[PDB]
Symmetry: C6
Subunit: 26 residues, 6 copies
């Protein structure tokens, strides 16, 4: 339900921040 | 209900971070 | 109650992120 | 309660992002 | 329990953002 | 279950923000 939805969007956020982190480093 | 509001806002946040992650590149 | 509180602060966060993404 | 705790940390998050948005 | 887990991680997120905001004066 | 999934993703987000905060420190 909505809890699975919330976990899925949090995973999305984590992966966007990893992209921001690697680029920032670069 | 409120759990749906929460999921929808996390989707918005994920999308804005995608924009920030892309911007820094382009 | 408390769930509505959480919803409203996530709206506030999405809104600050929108300001950040625009000015960048 | 843990829910109040969660809403309070989200406000603290929105606060810092407002500082990042205003600065940038 | 897991709700205490979630509050603690949000505290950790708010702390890293406070660090980013403080160094952001550049 | 679902709440543990949420906590785990928040840990992942906190870790990426830590990386960002430390890069920025430089």
């Amino acid at each position: 339900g909505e809890l699975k939805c919330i976990c899925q969007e949090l995973k999305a956020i984590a992966w966007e921040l990893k992209a921001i982190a690697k680029e920032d480093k670069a």
